[PDB]
């Protein structure tokens, strides 16, 4: 068959519609890893963009960043931090989170491969990789990924609540 996101509200149901797009503050509109569907707008986001890196840590009611300013109070935004960020900062922060999770699947990072992996321009990928280097999550030079430091210190610094 074909692989793409969809929803089973009960175990004997299947719903898919091209109207339920990916719409996430990272600006990437493709499925990639763990995806989560917003309770309010029924559109899809990358869990990692909302600092969710384990399907057991994901909320049962996900409220995306667009919806955070319009749902009643009892529906908490999944990542309140994002609501405080300026738009260009917001996109850069979610992309950084995607980059951190993506780097954990690579032994070495090469700029064209990395740009394609994340769907970004080369100059953006250079910016990300130079940041990974300063943090110590990859080496200076491709660039060997320091997987242990990334998964331990890096996830603590950027994802742990
Ligand atoms: Ni399914
Ligand atoms: Zn995203
Ligand atoms: Zn929403």
Numbering used by the authors: 333 to 473, 479 to 498
Question: From the publication, what sentences describe this entry?
Answer:
To determine these proteins’ structures and mechanisms of chromatin binding, we expressed and purified the Hop1 CBRs of two diverged aquatic Holozoa: Schistosoma mansoni (blood fluke) and P. miniata (star fish). We crystallized and determined high-resolution x-ray crystal structures of both proteins using single-wavelength anomalous diffraction (SAD) methods with the anomalous diffraction of endogenously bound Zn2+ ions. The structures show CBRs with PHD and wHTH domain tightly packed on one another in an overall configuration similar to that of the budding yeast Hop1 CBR, but lacking the HTH-C extension seen in that protein. The S. mansoni and P. miniata Hop1 CBRs are 43% identical at the amino acid level, and are nearly identical in structure, with an overall Cɑ root mean squared displacement (r.m.s.d.) of 1.4 Å over 136 residues. In contrast to the budding yeast Hop1 CBR, we find that S. mansoni and P. miniata Hop1 CBRs bind DNA via their wHTH domains through a canonical DNA binding interface. Mutation of arginine residues in each protein’s predicted DNA binding surface (R389 and R407 for S. mansoni; R463, R477, and R463 for P. miniata) to alanine resulted in a complete loss of DNA binding. We found that the P. miniata Hop1 CBR binds nucleosomes with an affinity in the low micromolar range and that alanine mutants in the PHD aromatic cage (position I residue W376) and the wHTH domain DNA binding surface (R480) each show reduced nucleosome binding. WT P. miniata Hop1 CBR bound to unmodified and H3K4me3 nucleosomes with roughly equivalent affinity, indicating the Hop1 CBR alone does not strongly discriminate between H3K4 methylation states in vitro. We also performed EMSAs with the isolated Widom 601 DNA, and observed that the wHTH domain mutant R480A, but not the PHD mutant W376A, reduced DNA binding. Overall, these data are consistent with bipartite recognition of nucleosomes by the P. miniata Hop1 CBR, with both the PHD and wHTH domain contributing to the interaction.
In meiosis, ploidy reduction is driven by a complex series of DNA breakage and recombination events between homologous chromosomes, orchestrated by meiotic HORMA domain proteins (HORMADs). Meiotic HORMADs possess a central chromatin binding region (CBR) whose architecture varies across eukaryotic groups. Here, we determine high-resolution crystal structures of the meiotic HORMAD CBR from two diverged aquatic Holozoa, Schistosoma mansoni and Patiria miniata, which reveal tightly associated plant homeodomain (PHD) and winged helix-turn-helix (wHTH) domains. Our data reveal how meiotic HORMADs with PHD–wHTH CBRs can bind chromatin and potentially discriminate between chromatin states to drive meiotic recombination to specific chromosomal regions.
